[PDB]
Amino acid sequence: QSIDQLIKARGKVYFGVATDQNRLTTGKNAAIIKADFGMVWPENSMQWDATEPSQGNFNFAGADYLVNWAQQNGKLIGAGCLVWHNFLPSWVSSITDKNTLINVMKNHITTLMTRYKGKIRTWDVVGEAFNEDGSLRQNVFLNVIGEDYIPIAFQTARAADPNAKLYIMDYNLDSASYPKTQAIVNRVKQWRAAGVPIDGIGSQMHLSAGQGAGVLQALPLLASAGTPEVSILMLDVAGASPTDYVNVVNACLNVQSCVGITVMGVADPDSAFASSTPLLFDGNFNPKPAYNAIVQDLQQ
């Protein structure tokens, strides 16, 4: 069965996957995504380097491919990330004037979001803002602009596409006793009391074995920030067993603001961690034991 249709039949929005043109035009990837997943994200093609490799010279070919594929095939779209240190060309990372960086960021956000206006459910606006101790990461935006870059990033995004759900996302938020988990809850609470339009917190989970158990208490904590939504992105898992998967699913089922779960990849070989077998379909396609468990957990 389709784990997307089954999660919707439980009152959730989607079960999604991260993909891109280079994965769709070969093999069985497109057929499996068509059958089993209701939302696609672009792995690489909407990051900054692929979209704006020089100032004001935008590049949308791959982004256009994915968006148009989603609409022809009945799939929702997520998109990002807009403001983070990964995939950040050096022409941006060498800027020093506060005004220069603000305008380039604003134009970047507004150029990408308006090209697809009304067609993207979720936008990852700010990613990987926090260090492990809860303080902010010393990327170029923080050092130069000050911690007001996060408010500017969200207030600019809302103007460009008010229909989009705007998220902040980070990793290592999978335990409620971590300092980074508590910090983001606290800082997202304050930001929202100041009017910063944060609509979702998206928890990137690279899970080892047994780590899924702690997500049952971490996810309700992320919900206490008062964002209308939270989501989960399960990056890695190869080390993990099916019981870690099931604890993540049950975590989303028992948190009423959790809207969906995205997995980073179809089939094992095409993962950055392919050798720990972290996904859901093996090298020959065909479902892994985990897959049947999710179906089982989500059934009747």
From Swiss-Prot:
Enzyme class: hydrolase
UniProt catalytic activity: Endohydrolysis of (1->4)-beta-D-xylosidic linkages in xylans
Xref: Pfam families: Glyco_hydro_10 (PF00331)
Highest taxon, organism lineage: Eukaryota
Key word S-adenosyl-L-methionine present: no
Alphabetized PROSITE patterns for the sequence: GH10_1, GH10_2
Hydrolase among keywords: yes
InterPro entries: GH10, GH10_AS, GH10_dom, Glycoside_hydrolase_SF
Active-site residues annotated for this sequence: E128 (proton donor), M234 (nucleophile)
Record SUPFAM superfamilies: (Trans)glycosidases (SSF51445)
Gene3D superfamilies: Glycosidases
Protein EC: 3.2.1.8
Keywords: Carbohydrate metabolism, Disulfide bond, Glycosidase, Hydrolase, Polysaccharide degradation, Pyrrolidone carboxylic acid, Signal, Xylan degradation
This protein's name: Endo-1,4-beta-xylanase
GO MF terms held by the record: endo-1,4-beta-xylanase activity
Domain GH10: 1-297
Source species of the chain: Thermoascus aurantiacus
Disulfide bridge partners, by residue number: C252-C258
Listed GO biological process terms: xylan catabolic process
Family: Belongs to the glycosyl hydrolase 10 (cellulase F) family.
